[PDB]
Ligand binder design. Structure first.
Ligand SMILES: [Ca+2]
Length: 217
């Protein structure tokens, strides 16, 4: 139950769940949520809130969809902004981003803290110091930005970033990263509308795999 139940995937790792997979955790108000734990990468104990792997799922979705979450436990998903807020409210959570290109290269980025605010603050990103990684830093430029979707423009651009670059993100004017963008399968001619991490493969290359995950700092 909530009194004794795990709050995150690090609690589950500590209790001897050593294989990655879906487990029930208890959010701060006791709401149970089934989450994907990555128990393998970089020490394990990561709660995964975004996964892309094959383009099977449409990510060009509205505020409501991003708010509640969408996709499949068996594949690609967005866990949901209300859930991500709840998961990152208590304590301090480090962010890890894992990327794989179509050539087989694995790259990563790590930040020392990560929080998304509530819906009243439009799921604003509060991001701590970049730690390092082969992917470089394409998220600090998004610190302190509201989340935006095609139907709800909260960016700091005169344009509608989510529509122009075909994703959903804490867009600024407009982005350095776009991991909820179109699944464009490597090199693309269109500018900056793919699963892009510009510090690594740039604005014209869309990754094969994206995983975003958190663990207590
Ligand atoms: Ca705008």
């Amino acid at each position: 139950s909530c009194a004794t139940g795990p709050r995150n995937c690090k609690d589950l790792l500590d209790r001897g769940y050593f294989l990655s997979g879906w487990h029930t955790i208890y959010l701060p108000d006791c709401r149970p949520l089934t989450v994907l734990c990555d128990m393998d990468t970089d020490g394990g104990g990561w709660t995964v809130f975004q996964r892309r792997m094959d383009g099977s799922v449409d990510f060009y979705r509205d505020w409501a969809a991003y708010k509640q979450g969408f996709g499949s436990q068996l594949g690609e998903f967005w866990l949901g902004n209300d859930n991500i807020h709840a998961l990152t409210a208590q304590g301090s959570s480090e962010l890890r981003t894992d990327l794989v290109d179509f050539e087989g290269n694995h790259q990563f980025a790590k930040y020392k803290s990560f929080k998304v605010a509530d819906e009243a603050e439009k799921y604003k990103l509060v991001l701590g110091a970049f730690v390092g990684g082969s992917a470089g830093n394409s998220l600090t430029g998004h610190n302190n930005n509201f989340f935006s979707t095609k139907d709800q423009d909260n960016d700091v651009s005169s344009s509608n970033c989510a529509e122009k670059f075909q994703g959903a993100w804490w867009y600024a004017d407009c982005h350095a990263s776009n991991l909820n963008g179109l699944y464009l399968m490597g090199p693309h001619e269109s500018y900056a509308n793919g699963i892009n991490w510009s510090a690594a493969k740039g604005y014209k290359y869309s990754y094969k795999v994206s995983e975003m995950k958190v663990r207590p700092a």
